């Protein structure tokens, strides 16, 4: 059984250097033709190939990132390290390392190369956020209005993830949509949480927001304005 | 470099259906192509290697064929765990490219979004910023287009949006879009509009308000 696992800092600041370690078990980077590669996935985006290293020590890099990447192996520790320099916000992504089989051998003779055509086992992935922000609590603002009505709370400018939002201390669940946060160009996150109700219920509505990182709890009652 | 284009980018289906996803390469990649299935929150999982070989431990309903520039993955009888995003990967040329992915989600009937526009709170305005949010609630299919207009000027580069995951009961999606402006710019205009295009809407729907109107 082959397993891989990524480790490194969850948070990194722009211009800094990011070092990610892939520790694995079940194979050796001294085994014939084996490879270990790195692939990343920005939130909501496609997979992007970064680099790979083989047991005979050949290395290859994405041409778009070549100047900022270094991949290396430590055979005796069963680890592969990828160093990315000068990171910027667009480098925020989940980073995965993965195993690549070498050709099948028969009495130590390569006879099948078809198994090298895939990365067959992946690590769970490590989430890395690139922002110059310091920890900071959200500002919470009201969002106020088939014949459904909508209202919500805009949880703005906080760092880092995550934040939790519930409605009426947990009693309101139907019609609730809490969207995934977006990382603003400022380096702070922002999210909305809304709830749809029969245009008659306008019943009271309060969003309970909690950002553990900054010890910031806020309850904000939202109503249909006009005094 | 080498381009790998998946089709369709998104696909709706129901348990028991037969689906086929295709991947086309800009130059021939021989048989060096792999297919993966990735469920939300998890790493991609290898299904098919070397264009058509079934990976060990992978269920037989998955099948891959093709070589050169055109490949296909077919799942013969879709199971609930197959609602996910699929990717193809080429390993013939460096860099080892991935396709754009194809999202497979629960089919349901077309539903237009209920649209709502929210002006910025007076509380936010006092801090100097103005957020205008637009909500597209419970729609299907997933693709929707939101266009912000301020006093008829098309907005660009000053909004961000996020979409919920498919609802497990509804099978619909919801989308939130935030237009952000300084309090000053905000004050220099009157009509804030959120224009929405979607398959379930005969023509675009616009929700708006005039700033400061009381």
């Amino acid at each position: 059984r082959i397993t891989l696992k990524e480790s490194g800092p969850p948070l990194v600041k722009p211009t800094q250097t990011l070092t990610l370690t892939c520790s694995f078990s079940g194979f050796s980077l001294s085994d014939f033709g084996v490879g270990v590669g790195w692939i990343r996935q920005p939130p909501g985006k496609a997979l992007e190939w970064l680099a790979i290293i083989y047991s005979d020590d050949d290395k290859r890099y994405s041409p778009s990132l070549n100047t900022r990447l270094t991949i290396t192996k430590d055979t005796s520790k069963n680890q592969v390290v990828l160093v990315m320099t000068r990171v910027s916000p667009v480098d925020t992504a989940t980073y995965f390392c993965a195993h690549r089989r070498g050709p099948t051998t028969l009495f130590g003779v390569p006879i099948a190369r078809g198994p090298v055509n895939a990365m067959d086992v992946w690590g769970q992935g490590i989430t890395v956020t690139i922002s110059s922000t310091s920890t900071k609590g959200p500002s919470v603002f009201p969002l106020a209005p088939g014949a459904a009505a909508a209202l919500g709370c805009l949880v703005k400018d906080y760092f880092p993830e995550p934040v939790t939002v519930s409605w009426n201390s947990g009693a309101l669940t139907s019609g609730v949509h809490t969207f995934p946060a977006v990382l603003q160009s400022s380096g702070l996150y922002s999210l909305s949480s809304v709830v749809t109700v029969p245009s008659s219920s306008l019943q009271t509505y309060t969003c309970n927001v909690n950002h553990k990182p900054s010890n910031t709890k806020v309850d904000k009652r939202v109503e249909p304005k006009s005094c | 470099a080498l381009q790998l284009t998946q089709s369709p980018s998104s696909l709706s289906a129901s348990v028991g259906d037969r689906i086929t996803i295709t991947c086309r390469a800009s130059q021939g990649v021989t048989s060096a192509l792999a297919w993966y299935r990735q469920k939300p929150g998890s790493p991609p999982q290898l299904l098919i290697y070397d264009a058509s070989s079934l990976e060990s431990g992978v269920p037989s309903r998955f099948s891959g064929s093709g070589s050169g520039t055109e490949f296909t993955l077919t799942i013969s009888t879709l199971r609930p765990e197959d609602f996910a995003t699929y990717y193809c990967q080429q390993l013939h040329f460096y860099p080892h490219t991935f396709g754009g992915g194809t999202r497979v989600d629960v089919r349901r009937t077309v539903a237009a979004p209920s649209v709502f526009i929210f002006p910025p709170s007076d509380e936010q305005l006092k801090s100097g910023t103005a957020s205008v949010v637009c909500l597209l609630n419970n729609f299907y299919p997933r693709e929707a287009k939101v266009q912000w207009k301020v006093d008829n000027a098309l907005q660009s580069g000053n909004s961000q949006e996020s979409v919920t995951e498919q609802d497990s009961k509804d099978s619909t999606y919801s989308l939130s879009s935030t237009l952000t402006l300084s309090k000053a710019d905000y004050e220099k205009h009157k009509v804030y509009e959120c224009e929405v295009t979607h398959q379930g809407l005969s023509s675009p729907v616009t929700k708006s308000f005039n700033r400061g109107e009381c």
Binding site: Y54, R113 | A32, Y94, H96
Partner: peptide, 7 residues
């Protein structure tokens, strides 16, 4: 250009 195992 070509993969390690190509050709």
């Amino acid at each position: 250009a070509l993969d390690k195992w190509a050709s």
